Amino acid sequence: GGARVGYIELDLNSGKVLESFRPEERFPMMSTFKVLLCGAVLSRIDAGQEQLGRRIHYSQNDLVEYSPVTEKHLTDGMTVGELCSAAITMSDNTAANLLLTTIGGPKELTAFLHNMGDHVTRLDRWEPELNEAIPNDERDTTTPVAMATTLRKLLSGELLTLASRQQLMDWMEADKVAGPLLRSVLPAGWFIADKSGAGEHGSRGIIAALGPDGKPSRIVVIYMTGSQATMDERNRQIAEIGASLIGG
């Protein structure tokens, strides 16, 4: 439906690319960036520059649209760990902004990425503006291969400590708001750890570590933008691309 689609699948062990389509074209990251964000936070924790338990007190004025978890803790605040859980598992937008604030914002997330060897992925804006997805706008974009390689480094490389690696995987495993995507076509008993995104201009995307027997063995990154299709159809389209990668 006019969609520009890009995807890649990696073997998690070897890092070998198994299949790709437009892997080096830029797509709006949308909420998929929230995994990289918590990656940067976990890296700071590893370095002793941040604590998982540090409580962040925020006010009504910090709340942006779609903050299902953060809107419930204006009185007592939330820990860095809780915010990352909210950002990843619920796609909480205020949580994402609060975490960006802790690391120094989008430029620092981008710097984090640069420093781990990702010179492609860039965050420029905050929630909700980063979801604008203006055609050919390079702000807040990644490529399928850059995202997949970065996800793989975060989840299986020695970039994060064992504890942080597993914490990041655990948050993604607990994703609550990606049901109509890869989860809808996954065989029973399969492990999936994912993060989805939706943006303007018919943009939709998902990043995932997944595999049979309750263990991940594959990285899958799928982005689309420019789609004329309804949300249900966009969901099915990603799901179908995913089912093809998992199957074939």
Q: What is the CATH number of the domain that holds 26?
A: 3.40.710.10
Instruction: Pull the structure tokens for residue 115.
Output: 């420093």
Number of domains within the chain = 1
**Domain of 246, in residue numbers:** 1-248
Nearest CA to 73 among 90, 94, 52, 53? 94
**Placement of tokens 């063995």 in the chain:** 217
Nearest CA to 37 among 109, 94, 139? 109
129 part of the active site? yes
Residue among 129, 138, 200, 240 flagged as catalytic? 129
Strand partners, 196: 206
Distances in Å between the Cα of 140 and the Cα atoms of 10, 50, 122, 132, 134 are: 23, 25, 5, 9, 10
Residue among 9, 20, 31, 91 flagged as catalytic? 31
CB atoms within 10 A of CB 177: 18
**Strand bridging mode 78-79 / 141-142:** unpaired
Nearest CA to 199 among 96, 97, 121, 130? 130
What's the start-to-end Cα distance of the chain, in Å? Answer: 23
Instruction: Pull the structure tokens for residue 1.
Output: 């439906």
Helix (H) or strand (E) holding 195: strand 191-199
164 part of the active site? no
